[PDB]
């Protein structure tokens, strides 16, 4: 009897954490939210390059997509013990690659410290590759 008739598939998730991401608007000299959701470190199984990929909750829209460059440095913000700021030279969340000053904030200091640990591990992976 005849019977009735994301582009992340190439990647391993090294780390996942809930975060709020901000971009600095120098024009207004103020921090602006870019998205809240899961921040993931994805290792491409072909190139072994690790990126940050972050998607807003509800819409699943990308608010961060960039290589974790070995040259980047996580720096504290004056207001927060659970956030890092860093310059990013090429983020393609909104299409064309652009530089940003990012700040990413977590639920706790432990999460922030863990993120930094993983961020550095990924930098080291991006150096060997």
């Amino acid at each position: 009897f005849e019977p009735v008739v994301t582009m992340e598939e190439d990647e391993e998730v090294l780390y996942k954490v809930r975060a709020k991401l901000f971009r600095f608007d120098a024009d207004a000299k103020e921090w602006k939210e870019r998205g809240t959701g899961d921040c993931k470190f994805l290792k491409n199984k072909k190139t072994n390059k690790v990126r940050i990929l972050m998607r807003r909750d509800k819409t699943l829209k990308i608010c961060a997509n960039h290589i974790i460059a070995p040259e980047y440095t996580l720096k504290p913000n004056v207001g927060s013990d659970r956030s890092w700021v860093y310059a990013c030279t090429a983020d393609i969340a909104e299409g064309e690659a652009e530089a940003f000053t990012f700040a990413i904030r977590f639920g706790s200091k432990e999460n922030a410290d863990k993120f930094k640990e993983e961020f550095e591990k990924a930098q080291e992976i991006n150096k060997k590759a």
Partner: protein, 994 residues
């Protein structure tokens, strides 16, 4: 060159306007923006109305003509009465001519509905100005012109629909009372003729578009017309048969019949009752034969969402619920109507299965009505047994979490009534749904959760014995389910549901001590489970059970060696060791609830001492090491510990209130020393590092300590019983610790919670501390006013707390304002009017209330110099400021209290309760009454503020206002009429005689 249209000095280029318009509507980015600004300026140009005729004739672009009509509408609604009669007639004829022309061209009629509809609304705006006093022939001509053309007839139904809307549905806020009554009476007088035309079209009409348009107008008429037009003509029969059969008319017809069901109707008339039954029979028969039978799966249909099915089914739910809520007793009396009654309800059951939250709530409101009635009405429930049985399943399967407060409440109430009507049926349904979770056929987290919510919701409806057997059965079954499931994801879901259910059955817990003890001990074990949500649910369940069963923890239970609260306290360090701070605070709060049940004071204080042992020991060690070494407060970790100590005190004080005093006494003096120590560090850090310091984790942690100290003090004083101890022991150290600190910090370092704390103090004991209240004012008044008097946005919390504080001081300790220097009392009046000009209700409402209370306070003082001086200085400031906020259109939420205040001020004068003259000498005759001077002042003031009003308008308004100043609802009416008249030219002064 697009800005050429703004020239106006030159003739208007129409092809250029159509460019700008096209660019706006179709264009993009930068181009759209520029065209936008130009168009907006063009439209707002006050002489642009002159260009309308030119645009309407010579433009090709229908959007241009739309905007032209907007411009004309501005003229018609604001400035019409400035136009000569001849010009008003010329405009009127041009509009009418343009509509007829567009309707007589079938191509235009079909393709330009937006422009025609806009034209029709423009016509109706003219009718509102002109009709019927300056256009008695309008309706006869309209009725006449209908016979000429089908397009014109259809369009005339749109005009009549809009007119009915403007006169009866939207008149209340847009017209004076007198003008609305005039247009209502006018339409009513000519309705016989309008109805005749509408009935004729429906009786002998082939055009579905014309029939639908006519039925749309009828829907609007049904809002106001007498029932005889429906019941004493053939129209009911037409609506409930013919128009239900064709789907083009079905949607509007069902809406008409819903409104028919709401008509005011004779209650004691057998013919009318038979007619009411009959149209319902006819309607449901048409649905069952032409749309879908009673058995149809509406859930499926609705989900598929073909064509207009969703709206149809929404409208059918509205019709059935509306009709049955009014008429189901009609269908219950005769047994030949039983099938109709049950089929209608079966349709509702089917509708209630639709997966659409807002539709479900609509049906649920009806079910609540029904089952409430079956719970009380004699000899009814047996009719509905099968309806109710189905409904039990529908509600159980749709139960939401108690967090959805209103929906959960509605569902619970329905399910409680249903449970009472047949407990066995409810019980069987729940036990069988539980078996389908256990056998896996219906297992899911959503499904077990919803079922648990349902089971919890009917707590207290069964007899104690029936409930006992039911709960044991449920708990055994859920426990078994929890065993079955693999992995703690699944086990945690079931455990939380077990926790949920047990917490909803306190009667069972109170009868079964061993079980209750076991449950508590299990929650304690779960307070070690770090799996997400488990510790939270355990702590939340603990406090919930305590809130309901607290007595059982404070007595010594049979075969226990001590009250269980002692056992909880003994082991508290072990119990709470793995919890987050917020969870620990909940735990201590729950213990506080139990301890307040102990009414022996010595025992209660001992329990309180024992509960607070760990916070108190940590506190003591910190206080000793902190004061001996003030550096220790720099430590991030210490600041956190101190904050958590204070928060624990707040938690326990929250549940113990007055009983907390011994613990407060233990920490109070060192806590105020800590407040000062912490204050210094913040001030030090701000100076050393800048205003940025207030954002830093360390300073935020320090400020948290100060705010939690204030919260503790607020919490205790708000609940205190011994107010003598509050005044004699607590208040003076408090004011010393906080007031100078507040005043002497920079704005950005001042805590608004200080204001809130002081509000509580004045509220509770302000009568007993007159000198304390003065100190409060002197410390916070000017420096806070200076923070908030530059704009409406800065320092939002201070703004709100500031006017709350002034409000309670003005209510409790008015003498404190009598002590102010005149210049500071002037700032007080300025501060009150500043609050009036706020758009935030939190500040605006308090401002108006303080003014009314202040007036009352001044009135109380009687005929003394201060009161007489107050009126001479401030009466007219309050009257004029109130009028400003009344009339500027930016403060509409405040209308009611503005009106009350104005009424109070006016009544003072028209009762002669102000002894002295308000006018300064050399202003009016020496003998002039305050009444006469007030009239003169207001007339002059309104004339200046609103120069387009006539003297006659202003005089009539003021005459009305002063006569009505002891009748608030009428007074408010007069105010609203004025607010209408100030938006236009040539308002009728006789309106104020309504």
């Amino acid at each position: 060159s697009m800005e050429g249209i703004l020239d106006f000095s030159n003739d208007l280029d129409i092809a250029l306007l159509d460019q700008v318009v096209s660019t706006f509507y179709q264009g993009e980015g930068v181009q759209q923006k520029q065209a936008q600004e130009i168009l907006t300026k063009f439209q707002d140009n006050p002489d642009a109305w002159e260009k309308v005729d030119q645009i309407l004739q010579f433009s090709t672009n229908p959007q241009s003509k739309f905007i032209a009509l907007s411009i004309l509408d501005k003229l018609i609604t604001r400035k019409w009465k400035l136009l000569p009669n001849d010009h008003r007639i010329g405009i009127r004829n041009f509009v009418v001519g343009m509509i007829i022309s567009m309707c007589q061209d079938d191509e235009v009629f079909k393709t330009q509905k937006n422009l025609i509809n806009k034209s029709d609304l423009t016509l109706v705006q003219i009718l509102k100005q002109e009709w019927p006093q300056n256009w008695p022939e309008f309706i006869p001509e309209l009725i006449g012109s209908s016979s000429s053309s089908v397009n014109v007839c259809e369009n005339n139904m749109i005009v009549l629909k809009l007119l009915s809307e403007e006169v009866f549905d939207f008149s209340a806020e847009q017209m004076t009372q007198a003008k609305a009554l005039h247009l209502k009476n006018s339409m009513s007088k000519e309705f016989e003729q309008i109805f005749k035309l509408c009935f004729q079209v429906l009786e002998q009409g082939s055009s579905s578009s014309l029939i639908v348009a006519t039925l749309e107008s009828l829907l609007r008429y049904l809002h106001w017309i007498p029932y005889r037009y429906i019941y004493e003509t053939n129209i009911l029969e037409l609506l409930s048969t013919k128009f239900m059969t064709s789907p083009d008319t079905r949607a509007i017809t069902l809406k008409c019949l819903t409104e028919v069901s709401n008509l005011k109707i004779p209650q004691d008339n057998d013919l009318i009752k038979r007619q009411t039954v009959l149209f319902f029979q006819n309607t449901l028969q048409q649905i069952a034969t032409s749309v879908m039978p009673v058995t149809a799966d509406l859930k499926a249909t609705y989900a598929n969402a073909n064509g207009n099915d969703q709206s149809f089914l929404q409208d059918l739910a509205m019709f059935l619920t509306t009709y049955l809520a009014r008429n189901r007793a009609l269908l219950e009396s005769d047994e030949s109507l039983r099938e109709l009654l049950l089929n209608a309800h079966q349709y509702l059951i089917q509708l209630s299965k639709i997966e659409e939250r807002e539709l479900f709530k609509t049906t649920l409101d009806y079910w609540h009505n029904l089952v409430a009635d079956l719970f009380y009405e004699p000899l009814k429930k047996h009719i509905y047994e099968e309806i109710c049985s189905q409904l039990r399943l529908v509600i159980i399967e749709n139960m939401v979490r108690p967090e959805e407060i209103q929906l959960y409440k509605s569902e619970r109430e329905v399910l409680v009534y249903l449970t009472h009507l047949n407990v066995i049926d409810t019980e069987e349904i729940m036990i069988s749904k539980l078996a389908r979770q256990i056998d896996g056929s219906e297992w899911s987290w959503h499904n077990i959760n919803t079922l648990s919510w349902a089971i919890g919701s009917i707590s207290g409806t069964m007899s104690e014995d029936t409930e006992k057997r039911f709960v044991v059965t449920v708990i055994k079954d859920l426990l078994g389910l929890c065993e079955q499931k693999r992995g703690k994801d699944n086990k945690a879901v079931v455990a939380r549901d077990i926790m949920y259910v047990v917490g909803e059955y306190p009667r069972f817990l109170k009868a079964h001590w061993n079980f209750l003890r076991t449950v508590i001990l299990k929650l304690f074990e779960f307070m070690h489970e770090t799996h997400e949500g488990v510790q939270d649910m355990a702590c939340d369940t603990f406090i919930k059970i305590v809130q309901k069963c607290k007595y059982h923890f404070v007595i010594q239970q049979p075969r226990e060696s001590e009250p269980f609260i002692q056992t909880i306290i003994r082991d508290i360090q072990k119990t709470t060791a793995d919890l987050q701070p917020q969870q620990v605070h909940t735990f201590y709060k729950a213990c506080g609830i139990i301890i307040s049940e102990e009414r022996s004071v010595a025992e209660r204080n001992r329990l309180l001492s024992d509960l607070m042992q760990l916070p108190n020991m940590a506190w003591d060690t910190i206080v000793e090491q902190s004061t001996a070494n003030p550096t220790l407060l720099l430590d991030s970790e210490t600041v956190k510990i101190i904050a958590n100590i204070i928060k624990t005190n707040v938690a326990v004080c929250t549940s113990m209130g007055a009983d907390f005093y011994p613990q407060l006494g233990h920490i109070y003096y060192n806590m105020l020393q800590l407040y000062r120590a912490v204050s210094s560090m913040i001030s030090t850090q701000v100076a050393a590092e800048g205003l940025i310091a207030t954002k830093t984790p360390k300073v935020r942690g320090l400020r948290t300590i100060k705010k939690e100290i204030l919260k503790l003090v607020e919490t205790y004083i708000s609940k205190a019983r011994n107010l003598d101890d509050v005044v004699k022991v607590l208040v003076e150290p408090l004011l010393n610790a906080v007031l100078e600190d507040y005043m002497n910090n920079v704005p950005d370092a001042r805590d608004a919670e200080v204001l809130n704390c002081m509000t509580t103090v004045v509220e509770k004991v302000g009568h007993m501390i007159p000198q304390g209240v003065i100190l409060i004012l002197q410390s916070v008044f000017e420096c806070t006013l200076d923070m908030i008097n530059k704009d409406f946005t800065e320092y939002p919390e201070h703004r709100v707390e500031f006017y709350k504080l002034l409000k309670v001081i003005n209510e409790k300790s008015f003498a404190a304002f009598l002590e102010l220097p005149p210049a500071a009392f002037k700032l007080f009046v300025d501060a009150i009017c500043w609050a009036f000009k706020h758009n935030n209700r939190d500040v605006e409402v308090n401002g108006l209330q303080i003014a009314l209370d202040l007036v009352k306070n001044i009135e109380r003082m009687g005929n003394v110099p201060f009161a007489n001086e107050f009126h001479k200085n401030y009466f007219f400031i309050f009257v004029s400021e109130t009028f400003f906020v009344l009339t500027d259109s930016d403060h509409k939420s405040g209308f009611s209290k503005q009106a009350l205040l104005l009424m109070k001020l006016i009544s003072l004068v028209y009762d002669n309760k102000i002894s002295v003259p308000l006018y300064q000498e050399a202003e009016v005759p020496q003998g002039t009454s305050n009444q006469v001077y007030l009239s003169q002042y207001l007339a002059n003031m309104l004339s200046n503020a609103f120069p387009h009003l006539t003297s006659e308008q202003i005089a009539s308004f003021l005459s009305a206002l002063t006569k009505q100043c002891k009748d608030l609802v009428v007074f408010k009416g007069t105010l609203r009429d004025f607010l209408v008249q100030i938006k236009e030219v040539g308002g009728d002064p006789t309106d104020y005689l309504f």
